[PDB]
Amino acid sequence: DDFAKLEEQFDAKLGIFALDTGTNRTVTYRPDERFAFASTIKALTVGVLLQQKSIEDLNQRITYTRDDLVNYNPITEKHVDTGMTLKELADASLRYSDNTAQNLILKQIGGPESLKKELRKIGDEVTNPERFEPELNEVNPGETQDTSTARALATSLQAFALEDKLPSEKRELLIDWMKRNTTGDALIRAGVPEGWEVADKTGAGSYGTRNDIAIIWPPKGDPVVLAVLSSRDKKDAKYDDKLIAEATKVVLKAL
Amino acid sequence: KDDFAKLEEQFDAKLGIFALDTGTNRTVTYRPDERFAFASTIKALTVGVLLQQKSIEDLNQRITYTRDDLVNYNPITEKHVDTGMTLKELADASLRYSDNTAQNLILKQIGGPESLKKELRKIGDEVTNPERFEPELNEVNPGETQDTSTARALATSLQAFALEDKLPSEKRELLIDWMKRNTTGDALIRAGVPEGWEVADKTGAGSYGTRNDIAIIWPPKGDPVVLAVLSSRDKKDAKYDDKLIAEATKVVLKAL
Structure with missing residues (x-):
């Protein structure tokens, strides 16, 4: 009901799954409810790319045009003239949520x-x-x-x-x-104790969707896998990062 | 699960269950954190630590023991007192026959x-x-x-x-x-799994009607399921029943 309370406080639906790989202890809340994944899919996309490409393959330069650029391209729109290596595109996609980088990958x-x-x-x-x-x-x-x-x-x-x-x-x-993600400081990273290392990929979308998936490393112990998803009932609803930070605090406590 | 509670009532035993489908992270739990005497199941964890300390070659090392080293149940070690046995042989005896001397030697x-x-x-x-x-x-x-x-x-x-x-x-x-290739668990988890499912397990039994079985199960199509089914009764000399573990396993499968 700590999660239910947060749902009421932020007027959002919460989806949570956390697993302590050292003990197989889990924390769940609407773990099997569907949410649009938004940018979190960028992490799984690079995972599959790494499956099919050797490390040298990542140095291959990818060329694209202004016509290839979409809505949010912080890094890609700055190198349309020179193209970018697959390694650089993976970096842009994961650390800046670059949309064109995701598309090219x-x-x-x-x-x-x-x-x-x-x-x-x-x-x-x-x-x-x-x-x-x-x-x-x-x-x-x-x-x-x-x-x-x-x-x-x-x-x-x-x-x-x-x-x-x-x-x-x-x-x-x-x-x-x-x-080295640059977009998640106010989410899961804001809900973990100092000294804990976080590797995450954030996401946001319509219906006030606000997500964050991560691997968290306590200073002492096995990693914790965590997915915190959320959505609101209005298409144009705004999200509040604090919901993710707060939900994470409950998870850490529970663990 | 009410199904687990009913088995506990029918067999007059307590169940400790934890199942994890490694492919989906779906779990089946029932008193997952209740302590039970591990009995022979410890033999699987002991061999794991052994393999962790010795090289595959070191496993060839011969081990010499006597009748002094023989305990209460040595189906295999009792036939090699004079010859001795290699660590690989002892591990085999401990895991597949629940040989007690082998466990102690390891x-x-x-x-x-x-x-x-x-x-x-x-x-x-x-x-x-x-x-x-x-x-x-x-x-x-x-x-x-x-x-x-x-x-x-x-x-x-x-x-x-x-x-x-x-x-x-x-x-x-x-x-x-x-x-x-364990020879002791045909009537336990193995008896509660569907045909086509592969099982790697280590059984155990002890005082207070303790009856355990821990295993890794491979369905035809899919990632392995790690499962631990423990049980005990309230009387020190209580008798256990293998059917309880087989039945509890069937519920875990349906659940998964």
């Missing part, structure tokens, strides 16, 4: 259909990617296109970052990028 | 109960409390934590050794292979 792996096939392969039968950015934001209550659950997103993130879906060196690249 | 090889506990603490297991050798570890009374653990801790520790990076792939398949 998605094309590299075969598009949404291939992304979905690869996730189904690793055991994710829930995440349903269907579109590129920013069209994936066009989700209405009741539909499953471009949605997932807290359990599914957390489990797929764990698969790529902590399990054997990727070899050591590649897991480390993914974790390093996410640890 | 326990000594890794440093004794204190060392086993220390290593388990090192991998994240803060509840499993090994203190004695076989068969003394069976001397446990309600309220005491000596030689007890929980379904959650036992399942998690098994997963760490068999499915996680606690052991190199090479040693992990050695452990899984022995357990897959």
